[PDB]
């Protein structure tokens with residue numbers, strides 16, 4: 287530390303890492319970048335891939351939301367207890383990222399014409415996570431092993447935004463329903479999710495959610 | 496170990512991990528899955544995300560190409576020397592993945608109509624990697640630090656397949672050109688790139704490259 291998140295005034299690819307920091311009792315600074323400021327062209331060319339989020343942890347400056355999550359995982363001991371768990375956590379997180387990519391593409395490029403096919407195809411994309419939960423202490427612990435990891439925060443966010451997109455998408459996925467309920471109920475996440483910083487921030491950069 | 500790769504008969508998302516294993520002096524088995532076998536629908540339901548590659552390292556079964564690369568990185572000491580390097584390697588690999596994703600979309604969905612725009616947009620996506628190299632011992636070493644990492648193999652593969660897509664795309668990226676040449680010249684990679692199993696394998700699954 288200190289921690290700084292440099293991002294658009296949205297939840298997007300930062301709410302997972304924000305929930306992570308909150309739940310871990312870490313404080314951080316938000317450097318909010320408007321599109322107006324972004325369109326000025328001063329910051330964009332200094333970013334590695336010309337994109338946000340950008341994250342600072344003391345002397346370490348990072349880009350790529352999942353690299354940031356993995357760094358937080360390794361540094362804060364949220365990357366499982368062993369080599370198997372670390373690999374399985376990567377496998378989970380890559381799955382989360384696949385579906386997030388499909389979600390982002392829908393929201394920003396094809397919402398009106400593509401939502402119906404998306405929500406229709408969604409249960410097939412959520413089943414893997416229910417399956418993962420089913421094979422880990424009957425879904426009563428975390429996505430991998432018995433301790434919270436970076437992969438949990440990301441999957442939790444993915445499930446949260448998808449409930450907004452499709453209200454009852456988790457009714458046919460009991461383990462994922464209770465999982466969302468259980469992790470959201472953790473005191474520090476509970477507090478974060480009800481905080482003005484979170485509540486008064488749109489999920490995405492357009493209207494669409 | 497033992498190592499087993501379960502995949503379709505293409506280079507695709509497995510050539511990087513193959514070059515990794517080859518370069519590290521590791522042997523592995525190929526379990527080639529044909530469209531016919533996939534269609535018969537016994538293996539697909541058992542795969543976590545209904546997709547390949549599937550990877551076995553002794554008792555550990557994995558899906559997700561990048562999770563496999565990260566696992567090989569962690570277990571074979573190809574994940575840098577410290578926290579900073581590990582995070583920067585993740586930042587590089589995620590960038591490689593982003594571009595590979597765009598590549599896959601071009602190849603498999605919009606090759607003819609989209610190739611023109613893809614190639615004109617390509618230099619903007621290659622520049623970050625040239626910049627990284629220029630800032631790491633003047634491009635004389637690896638993408639991050641002075642030892643080969645899982646990120647190098649993934650980047651190397653991505654660059655190679657783009658040299659097929661756009662013959663001269665590295666002309667204006669001299670450090671990447673030399674980087675490709677130098678890594679390709681590593682005896683075990685040089686050997687692997689000539690080997691019939693690689694040479695006889697098509698880059699993609701639809702016969703487009």
Ligand SMILES: N[C@@H](CCC(=O)N[C@@H](CSCc1ccc([N+](=O)[O-])cc1)C(=O)NCC(=O)O)C(=O)O
Pocket residue numbers: 294295296298299321330336337338339349350351352490491492589593
């Ligand atoms: N692979 C990268 C993807 C990063 C990314 O897509 N960043 C978007 C913002 S996240 C999605 C997003 C986009 C826009 C807004 N907004 O409010 O304007 C909010 C969120 C961006 O920087 N766009 C600016 C640009 O490319 O020039 C990662 O995981 O970090």
Ligand SMILES: N[C@@H](CCC(=O)N[C@@H](CSCc1ccc([N+](=O)[O-])cc1)C(=O)NCC(=O)O)C(=O)O
Pocket residue numbers: 380384503505507508530539545546547548558559560561699700701
């Ligand atoms: N995020 C995953 C992506 C893997 C993936 O996309 N797998 C696909 C493509 S394999 C490479 C491939 C693509 C297309 C053909 N083809 O026939 O044209 C052949 C092989 C797959 O298994 N598809 C089977 C399915 O979904 O049922 C990863 O990184 O491993």
